[PDB]
Design a protein around this ligand. Structure first.
Ligand SMILES: [Mg+2]
Ligand SMILES: [Mg+2]
Ligand SMILES: [Mg+2]
Ligand SMILES: [Mg+2]
Lengths: 290, 44, 306, 94, 51, 139, 49, 122, 190, 87
RNA sequence: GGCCCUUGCGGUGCUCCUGGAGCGCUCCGGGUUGCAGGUGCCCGAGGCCGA
RNA sequence: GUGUAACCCCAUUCGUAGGAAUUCCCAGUAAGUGCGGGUCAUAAGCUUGCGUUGAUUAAGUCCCUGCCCUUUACACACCGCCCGUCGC
RNA sequence: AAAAAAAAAAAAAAAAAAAAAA
C-alpha cells in the first residue's frame, strides 16, 4: 500500500506537468478543424504538420477521456461517492474549542470528530488514508476563540489554509434546539475569478449530493476576499413569500494558502498560490473577485 | 562453471564484414595524451 | 453445470442450511444458485470494477462476503436484499482468504501485510481485531466448533490462535515436510526452491484433532495439532509424466549442452489446437501445457467425516 | 449550486425495474415490451456485416491479451437483461 | 527541498553492488580507507630501514 | 574455528536495543553493567523474566551484551527483554539443534508473546467506522 | 579521516637537509605566484569575451 | 476509426480496448485511440519482469536482472517466478520484491544496518 | 519452574470457594506473572479484562483513586508493601486473602431504579459476575483511600487492613458495609 | 537419548540406570508420548518421553528376546526365551 | 573415545546400466511385390527508463 | 528543532479546594510532566509541534429529548391491504 | 560548482584524489 501511494503520486504530478502541453496541443487542433469545415486558408503556424492534426482529429471520438485536468484527477470521486469528513483539533484543546469542533460535525453530513491526544500529525494522515477518509479538517484556537482552519483532501489533494474572523457559536445562543441535519443545498455567490472558482470547488465537495425537496441552505458569500458562512432553513408560508430562520454557527474565512500536497508534506509540496502582504500594491488588490 | 543470462551467438553490429553505412559505431574513445603535441592550422 | 460466469471461478461455497451454492469469479461477480429450480437468482457486483479472489458466506446465510485482488477491501452484501451492506477496509495488500466463524458470526480475513483481521458483524460499536504475524499470511480456517483458528504463513509455519482471546496457542514448523522436486527448466536445485515455498492449503478434520496441509508437491501432510507432530504423509500421485514430481532429475538424460528440454517441449506442443504464447503460466496458450506441474490446489473434509 | 450527480455506467436491478415501469404506465405486460425491444436490437447487430466482423476481431484479441496478464484485467459490469424461462419440469436443465 | 523530495520515492529494496562491501555508519555512507595488508617479512624490513 | 555470534534487534516505542550473543560462560551485560544494576529496579523482575523461565543451564553457554538507546525507562526495559530473548532463540537455532530452539520458542510464546514479537500500537477507533453495526445500517 | 596509526606501526618522518628545503620552498612559492597569475588572466579573457 | 464517430458500438469498443491496454501499461494514458497506434512489439518488451527490475532500481544491468529471476531471488506476491518472459501488470509491479531468506536481501538489510538474524533466518 | 508473585507468593495453594466467580478471577497457573505490570491491551474488547490477572486489575484500580493518574510504579510498590504487611500480620498467603476479600465484598443483587422528577422506585435485580468483581475491587480501593485520608497512616497499612477485614468478613470494613446496605435495600425493594 | 543433528546428550531414563540387567529392546511411540524398554531381568517399563518419568512396570514370565513396535496401531510384539510370543 | 609411517590441511586422472531414446537373433520362415482435390510464411523504431 | 529533561526512584528530618445551575469526554482516550519552534495568516502572561508515564466504566435500547427515512430483483422459507379531511 | 580525504610549503597556500548538484 505504501508503494502504491508513492506510485500514484508520481503519476499525478507527471500528468500535471503535461496539462499545459496538451491544452496547447488541443487548441491548435480546432483552428485547423475550423479551417477545413469552412473553406479558408489554414493559418501559417498550422501550415506545417497540418495532415498530422487531421489524422488525430479523425481518431478523435467520444470514447476517449480527452485532455487531462489536475482538478478532475484530485476530485475523482466527487459526484459518484459521498465524502467522508473527519474533524480534529490541535493538541491540548480549550473547552470552547471542543464545543466548536462538536458543531462542525453537525454542519457536515456524515462527519465524525475524534479526540486529538498525543497523535503525531503524520500518523493521522496515514490512518485516514487507510480507512478511506476523504477529507480532513484541523482547527486552531486562541484564548478560547477559534482562529484557524485547514481543509485537506487526503488522496494527494489540495490543502487550503483559512483564518477565522467573526465566530459566533450556537452554544452562546440559548434555547435554539436541534438542527435539521438533512443533506443541504449549497449557495455559492461572489466567486468570479479563476482562483475563486478553485476555492469554491474545495468548499463544495465537502458536502454530499442533496435531495430536491431539502429545506436546508448553506451559503458561502465572498465580499472583498472574505468568505461568509451562513446556515439557514426556509419555510414557504405561501406562494412567493418565504421565511428564513437562522441556525448553526456564523463565521468568516480568509484564504492565504493552497498547497498541492497534504498537511503531512509541508516540506515538499509546492504552493499553488500564496497571499503576499508586503507587495507595494497589496492593500489595493483582490484575488477572489474580478 | 554454470552460466546464466546466456544469449545465442549472433552477428554484431560493429563487424567490418558489414559496410560502413551499416556499421553501428567505431566505439572508440580518444584521450588527448599530455605528452602529445598540439598542432593547429591558423592562417596568418 | 452452470455457465453463467464468463471468466474463471476462484472460490465456491455451500450455504450451511439450504441447497444453495455461491461462487465468486474473476468477472467481478459473486453469483448464488439454487438447486431446487436451477437458476442464478442473485448476483452481487461491486460499485467499482474489481476482481474477487474468494467467497465466504455466514452460517445463517444472510451475509455474503468477498475479497479483491486489487482494491484491498472486503465487500459485504445482504443475501435477501442484494444491496452492498458495507466495505471493510484496513488491510494492506490483497486478501489471501476469508472464513466465517461457524458459531459466532465473525469474519476472519488474512492479508499479505503479515496480518489476520477479525471483523464483528452483529456488533453495535464495530469492534475489530488485528493479529500480527512474522511473515505473510496465505490461508485461514476455523475448527468445526469455532474456538481455534489456523494461519499458514509464508515461512511455512502453521500458527494456531484463540480468536476470542487473541493469544497464540501453538505453532507447527512444516518446511522440511513439503518435499518438492525440481522442474525440467529450473536452473536452481530442489532445496533452493523449497526455501521459498510454503503451505497454501489447510483443512481441519471433522473432529478437529488433526490438520491437513498441502501445496506444490505430490504430498499431503496430516499433523496432530496438539502434539505438533506429523502423523502421516499421503502421496497423491506417482505419475512421472507430470512436472516437478521427483527431487533429483535423472542423470541419464544429461548431455554436454544440457538436458535439452526445448526439443521435448516442441514435441509436446505439437498437439496444435492453439498457439503457445510467451509468458502464460496456465491454459491453452501456455507453452508448458502438455506436462503441467503437480499442485494440490485445494483440500476439503466431509462434514460427515467419512 | 450543488454537487451534480454524475452518470454511472453500472445499472443495478433496482433502477432497471423503475425505468420499465416508468415509461410503460401487468408485470408480464411490462416484461413483454422490453423483451421484444431486446430481440429487435439483437437482430440489428447481426444484420450489419461490419459490426459482426469487428466484434469477432475483438474476441480473438482480448482472449490473447488477458492470458499475457495471467487474467488480471479491469472487469466489465454485468448488464441487466430479460431471459425466457418456459414451464416444463426441471429435469431438462440437468 | 530538492533533497527531501527525493526521499519520498526512495525504494527500500533497491540494491547496488557497492552496498555489499560498504556499511552505513549512523546513516552516513563513509568510504573507509583501503587496508595496506603488509606481511611480517616486509614489516621486519621497514624496521631495519628505520634504524 | 570462526567465532559463533548473532546480533538481534528489539524495539519498544522509540527504544531500540541491539543484542550480541556469542559462545561464552554465562555473562549478560547491558551497557557495560550487570542486569541487577539496571534502573528502575521496580521492574527488575520484568528484566529477569527469560532466565527464570529457562534456567541457568541454558544461559551457561553464551555471553550476551546489549546496547539500548532511546525512549524512557519502561520502554528500554521492554526492549532489553525482547532483544535478549530473540538473541538467545537465534543462537540456539544457528549453532544448536532445532529441537531445543522449538522448545525454548514455544515456552517464551506460551508465557508472553511480547518477548519475541513486537506489536506496534496503531490508530483504531469507533470514529473511523460509521454509526451502527456493519450489518443493519441503512437496511 | 583515519588519522590514527599505532605506536608500533608508525615510522619516523624524513629529516630534510637545509639545502633541500631551500630548493623545495622556492618551487612552492614560485608555483603559488604562477597559479595566481594564470587565474587572474582567466577572468580578463572571460570579461573581454 | 472507420466506423462513424457517433455510433454506440464504436464508443463501447473504444473504451474496452483502451482500458485493457492501460492496465497492461502499453499505453501511457487512457486518452484517444491515437495512442493505440503507438503500441509496438517493443511496448511488450518494456513490460517484462527483467526490465521492470531495472526500473525499480533493484538491478542496474539487464544481464544482472535476467540473472536474478533465473536464480529465484524475486517474487511477485507469494509466488516466486523464474520465467524472464513474464509481463507484469501495473497493479502487480507494486508487489515485486526480494524473496525472503535470499542473500541479496541479506546484503540490502546489512547495508541499511537493519539486519536481525531472528526474522530473516527464523 | 514455579512462578511466584514478587518472587515469594505462590499461586498453586490459592483456591476459590465460589463456583460463580471461578471464570472471572485470573490467579491460577496460566495467568501467573512475576510482576503486576504486563502492558497488555485488556480494554480493547468486551469481556477481555476477565483475562487480566486480578493483581494487575487491583494495581490499575488503585491508580485511579486519590492520585495523579499515570503513576503505576508507585502503585506497584504500594501493593507490594501491602502484601508484605498482610503476610506479617496474618501469616497466610496474601493472594488467598485478596481472593477471599474480593469474593466477600461483591454484592449479589442490586436495585435497578426507575426515576421521575417526583419520586424514584426500585426493583431488585441480579448482578453479573463481572460487575461483582468490578464493584468489589472499586469498593476495596475506595475504602483504602478514604481510610488513608487525613491520618498519620500510609496508604499501604490502610489497604492491608482493609483486605484483612474484608477477607475475615468483619463489618469494620468499608466494602462490607456497602455490600450489606446494598443487599438490604434490594431486599426491601423486592 | 541423543539428538541426531548435533549428537548432544539430552538426558537419560531412570535416576541412575533404567534396568538392573541388560537392555534388550527400546521403542518410541509414533506421537513421541511413551517410551517402552525391556530388561534381561524380565521387567517391562513404560516411560514418558518428554519429562522421563516412570509410569508403569510389567513383569514377564520369561526373559524377553527381541522387541518391535507397530507405531500406528499401537501394537507391541514380544518374543520370550520360552519360545512363546506375547502381544 | 579408539587411529600410532601422522595431519582442525588441500587437489587431481579413469569406472559407475538413456523411461519414451542401441530396435530387430531357439526353431519355423521372407519367395513369383504379383498421378482425386492443395496459394502458404514473413514484414513497427516513440520509453512515466537506468547508468 | 544549523541563516556569519522533568516527572519518576532510593534514603533523611518534621508533623496536624470552591454552591445552585451548566459544558465536555470512549483507547495510547481522560489526566500529569518536560523539551523545542515563532515558520509571508493568527499568535506574547499567548500559539503550535515533539516525546515520556498512562487509567475507571461501556460494545445496547427507544423509556424522556430529538434526528433521518418509509407504509405499493416473485429461488426456498416467511408474510398477506395504513387511516382521515378539503379542493377541483 | 561544491562538501571531503591524502602530501608538502609559508607566517595559510599549493599538487594530485573521491562523491554530490548541474
Ligand atoms: Mg490533555
Ligand atoms: Mg498527552
Ligand atoms: Mg473542583
Ligand atoms: Mg506540556
Amino acid at each position: 500500500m505504501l508503494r502504491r501511494e508513492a506510485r500514484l503520486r508520481r503519476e499525478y504530478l507527471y500528468r500535471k506537468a503535461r496539462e499545459e502541453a496538451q491544452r496547447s496541443a488541443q487548441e491548435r487542433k480546432e483552428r485547423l478543424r475550423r479551417a477545413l469545415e469552412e473553406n479558408r486558408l489554414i493559418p501559417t503556424e498550422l501550415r506545417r504538420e497540418a495532415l498530422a492534426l487531421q489524422g488525430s482529429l479523425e481518431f478523435d471520438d467520444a470514447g476517449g477521456e480527452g485532455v487531462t485536468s489536475h482538478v478532475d484527477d484530485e476530485y475523482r470521486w466527487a459526484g459518484v461517492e459521498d465524502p467522508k469528513v473527519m474533524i480534529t483539533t490541535s493538541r491540548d484543546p480549550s473547552s470552547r474549542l471542543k464545543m466548536f469542533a462538536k458543531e462542525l460535525k453537525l454542519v457536515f453530513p456524515g462527519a465524525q470528530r475524534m479526540n486529538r491526544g498525543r497523535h503525531e500529525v503524520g500518523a493521522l494522515v496515514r490512518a485516514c488514508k487507510a480507512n478511506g477518509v476523504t477529507d480532513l479538517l484541523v482547527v486552531h484556537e486562541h484564548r478560547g476563540t477559534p482562529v484557524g482552519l485547514i481543509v485537506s483532501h487526503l488522496p494527494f489533494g489540495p490543502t487550503a489554509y483559512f483564518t477565522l474572523c467573526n465566530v459566533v457559536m450556537r452554544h452562546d445562543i440559548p434555547d435554539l434546539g436541534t438542527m435539521s441535519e438533512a443533506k443541504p443545498h449549497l449557495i455559492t455567490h461572489g466567486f468570479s475569478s479563476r482562483l475563486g472558482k478553485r476555492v469554491s470547488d474545495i468548499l463544495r465537495y465537502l458536502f454530499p449530493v442533496p435531495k430536491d425537496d431539502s429545506h436546508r441552505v448553506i451559503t458561502f458569500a465572498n465580499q472583498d476576499d472574505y468568505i461568509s458562512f451562513r446556515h439557514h432553513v426556509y419555510k414557504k408560508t405561501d406562494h412567493r413569500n418565504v421565511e428564513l430562520t437562522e441556525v448553526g454557527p456564523r463565521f468568516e474565512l480568509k484564504l492565504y494558502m493552497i498547497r498541492l500536497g497534504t498537511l503531512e508534506q509541508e516540506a515538499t509540496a509546492d504552493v499553488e498560490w500564496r497571499w503576499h502582504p508586503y507587495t507595494n500594491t497589496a492593500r489595493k488588490r483582490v484575488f477572489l473577485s474580478t | 562453471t554454470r552460466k546464466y543470462a546466456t544469449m545465442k551467438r549472433m552477428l554484431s553490429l560493429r563487424d567490418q564484414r558489414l559496410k560502413e553505412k551499416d556499421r553501428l559505431k567505431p566505439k572508440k574513445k580518444e584521450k588527448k595524451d599530455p605528452s602529445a603535441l598540439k598542432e593547429r592550422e591558423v592562417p596568418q | 453445470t452452470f455457465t453463467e460466469h464468463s471468466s474463471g471461478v476462484t472460490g465456491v461455497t455451500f450455504t450451511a442450511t439450504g441447497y444453495v451454492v455461491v461462487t465468486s469469479s474473476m468477472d467481478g461477480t459473486v453469483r448464488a444458485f439454487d438447486l431446487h429450480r436451477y437458476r442464478n437468482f442473485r448476483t452481487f457486483t461491486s460499485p467499482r470494477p474489481t476482481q474477487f479472489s474468494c467467497v465466504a458466506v455466514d452460517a445463517s446465510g444472510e451475509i455474503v462476503s468477498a475479497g479483491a485482488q486489487d482494491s484491498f477491501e472486503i465487500f459485504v452484501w445482504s443475501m435477501q436484499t442484494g444491496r452492498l451492506l458495507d466495505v471493510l477496509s484496513g488491510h494492506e495488500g490483497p486478501i489471501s482468504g476469508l472464513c466465517f466463524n461457524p458459531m459466532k458470526s465473525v469474519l476472519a480475513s488474512a492479508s499479505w501485510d503479515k496480518t489476520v483481521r477479525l471483523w464483528d458483524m452483529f456488533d453495535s460499536w464495530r469492534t475489530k481485531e488485528t493479529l500480527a504475524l512474522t511473515s505473510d499470511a496465505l490461508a485461514v480456517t476455523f475448527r468445526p466448533d469455532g474456538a481455534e483458528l489456523a494461519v499458514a504463513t509464508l515461512n511455512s509455519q502453521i500458527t494456531f490462535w484463540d480468536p476470542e482471546n487473541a493469544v497464540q496457542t501453538g505453532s507447527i514448523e512444516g518446511r522440511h515436510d513439503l518435499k518438492t522436486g525440481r522442474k525440467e527448466l529450473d536452473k536452481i536445485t530442489a532445496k533452493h526452491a523449497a526455501k521459498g515455498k510454503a503451505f497454501t492449503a489447510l483443512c481441519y478434520s471433522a473432529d478437529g484433532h488433526s490438520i491437513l496441509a498441502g501445496g506444490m508437491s505430490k504430498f499431503v501432510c496430516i499433523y496432530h495439532v496438539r502434539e505438533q507432530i506429523l502423523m502421516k504423509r499421503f502421496e497423491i500421485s506417482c505419475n512421472l509424466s507430470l512436472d516437478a514430481m521427483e527431487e533429483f532429475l535423472n542423470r541419464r538424460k544429461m548431455t554436454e549442452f544440457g538436458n535439452l528440454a526445448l526439443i521435448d517441449q516442441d514435441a509436446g506442443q505439437e498437439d496444435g489446437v492453439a498457439i503457445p504464447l510467451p509468458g502464460v503460466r496456465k491454459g491453452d496458450m501456455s507453452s508448458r501445457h502438455f506436462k503441467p506441474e503437480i499442485r494440490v490446489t485445494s483440500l476439503r473434509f466431509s462434514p460427515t467425516g467419512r | 449550486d450543488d454537487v451534480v450527480r454524475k452518470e454511472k455506467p453500472k445499472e443495478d436491478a433496482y433502477e432497471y425495474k423503475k425505468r420499465l415501469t416508468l415509461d410503460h404506465e401487468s408485470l408480464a405486460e411490462i416484461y413483454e415490451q422490453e423483451y421484444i425491444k431486446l430481440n429487435q436490437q439483437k437482430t440489428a447487430e447481426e444484420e450489419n456485416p461490419e459490426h459482426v466482423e469487428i466484434q469477432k476481431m475483438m474476441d480473438s484479441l482480448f482472449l490473447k491479451l488477458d492470458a499475457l496478464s495471467n487474467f488480471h484485467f479491469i472487469p466489465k459490469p454485468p448488464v441487466p437483461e430479460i431471459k425466457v424461462v418456459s414451464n416444463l419440469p426441471a429435469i431438462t436443465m440437468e | 527541498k530538492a533533497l527531501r523530495k527525493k526521499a519520498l520515492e526512495k525504494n527500500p529494496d533497491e540494491f547496488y553492488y557497492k552496498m555489499t562491501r560498504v556499511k552505513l555508519q549512523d546513516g552516513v555512507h563513509i568510504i573507509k580507507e583501503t587496508k595496506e595488508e603488509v606481511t611480517p617479512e616486509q614489516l621486519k624490513l621497514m624496521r631495519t630501514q628505520d634504524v | 574455528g570462526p567465532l559463533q555470534s548473532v546480533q538481534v534487534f528489539g524495539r519498544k516505542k522509540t527504544a531500540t536495543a541491539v543484542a550480541h550473543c556469542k559462545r561464552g560462560n554465562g555473562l549478560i551485560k547491558v551497557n557495560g553493567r550487570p542486569l541487577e544494576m539496571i534502573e528502575p529496579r521496580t521492574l527488575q523482575y520484568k528484566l529477569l523474566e527469560p532466565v527464570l523461565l529457562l534456567g541457568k543451564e541454558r544461559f551457561a553457554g553464551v555471553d550476551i551484551r546489549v546496547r539500548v538507546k532511546g525512549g524512557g525507562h519502561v520502554a528500554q526495559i521492554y526492549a532489553i527483554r525482547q532483544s535478549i530473548s530473540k538473541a538467545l532463540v537465534a543462537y540456539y537455532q544457528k549453532y544448536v539443534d532445532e529441537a531445543s530452539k522449538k522448545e525454548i520458542k514455544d515456552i517464551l510464546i506460551q508465557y508472553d508473546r511480547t518477548l519475541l514479537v513486537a506489536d506496534p500500537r496503531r490508530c483504531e477507533s469507533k470514529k473511523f467506522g460509521g454509526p451502527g453495526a456493519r450489518a443493519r445500517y441503512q437496511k | 579521516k583515519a588519522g590514527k596509526v599505532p605506536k608500533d606501526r608508525r615510522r619516523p618522518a624524513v629529516i630534510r637537509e637545509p639545502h633541500e628545503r631551500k630548493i623545495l620552498a622556492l618551487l612552492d612559492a614560485l608555483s603559488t605566484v604562477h597559479s595566481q597569475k594564470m587565474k587572474k588572466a582567466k577572468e580578463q579573457r572571460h570579461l573581454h569575451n | 476509426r472507420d466506423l462513424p464517430e457517433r455510433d454506440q458500438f464504436r464508443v463501447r469498443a473504444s473504451a474496452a480496448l483502451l482500458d485493457k491496454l492501460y492496465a497492461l501499461g502499453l499505453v501511457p494514458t487512457r486518452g484517444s485511440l491515437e495512442l493505440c497506434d503507438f503500441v509496438t512489439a517493443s511496448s511488450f518488451c518494456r513490460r517484462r519482469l527483467p526490465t521492470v527490475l531495472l526500473k525499480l532500481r533493484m538491478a542496474q544491468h539487464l544481464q544482472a536482472a535476467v540473472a536474478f529471476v533465473e536464480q529465484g531471488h524475486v517474487r511477485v506476491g507469494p509466488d516466486v517466478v523464474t520465467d524472464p518472459a513474464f509481463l507484469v501488470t501495473r497493479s502487480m509491479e507494486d508487489f515485486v520484491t526480494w524473496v525472503d531468506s535470499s542473500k541479496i536481501k541479506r546484503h540490502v538489510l546489512e547495508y541499511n544496518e537493519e539486519r536481525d538474524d531472528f526474522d530473516l533466518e527464523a | 519452574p514455579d512462578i511466584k508473585l514478587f518472587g515469594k507468593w505462590s499461586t498453586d495453594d490459592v483456591q476459590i470457594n465460589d463456583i460463580s466467580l471461578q471464570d472471572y478471577i485470573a490467579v491460577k497457573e496460566k495467568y501467573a506473572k512475576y510482576l503486576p505490570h504486563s502492558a497488555g491491551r485488556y480494554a480493547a474488547k468486551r469481556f477481555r479484562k476477565a483475562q487480566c490477572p486480578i493483581v494487575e486489575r487491583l494495581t490499575n484500580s488503585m491508580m485511579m483513586h486519590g492520585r495523579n493518574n499515570g503513576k503505576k510504579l508507585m502503585t506497584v510498590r504500594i501493593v507490594k508493601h501491602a502484601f508484605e504487611i498482610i503476610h506479617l500480620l496474618t501469616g497466610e498467603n496474601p493472594l488467598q486473602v485478596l481472593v477471599n476479600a474480593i469474593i466477600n465484598s461483591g454484592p449479589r443483587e442490586d436495585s435497578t431504579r426507575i426515576g421521575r422528577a417526583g419520586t424514584v422506585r426500585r426493583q431488585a435485580v441480579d448482578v453479573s459476575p463481572l460487575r461483582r468483581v468490578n464493584q468489589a475491587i472499586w469498593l476495596l480501593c475506595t475504602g483504602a483511600r478514604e481510610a488513608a485520608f487525613r491520618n498519620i497512616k500510609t496508604i499501604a497499612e490502610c489497604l492491608a487492613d482493609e483486605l484483612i477485614n474484608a477477607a475475615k468478613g468483619s463489618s469494620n470494613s468499608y466494602a462490607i458495609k456497602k455490600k450489606d446496605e446494598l443487599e438490604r435495600v434490594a431486599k426491601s425493594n423486592r | 537419548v541423543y539428538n541426531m543433528q548435533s549428537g548432544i546428550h539430552r538426558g537419560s531414563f531412570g535416576k541412575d540406570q533404567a534396568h538392573k540387567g541388560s537392555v534388550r529392546g527400546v521403542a518410541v511411540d509414533g506421537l513421541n508420548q511413551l517410551t517402552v524398554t525391556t530388561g534381561s531381568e524380565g521387567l517391562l517399563k513404560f516411560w514418558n518421553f518428554k519429562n522421563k518419568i516412570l509410569i508403569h512396570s510389567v513383569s514377564l514370565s520369561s526373559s524377553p528376546n527381541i522387541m518391535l513396535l507397530h507405531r500406528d496401531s499401537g501394537i507391541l510384539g514380544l518374543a520370550l526365551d520360552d519360545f512363546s510370543i506375547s502381544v
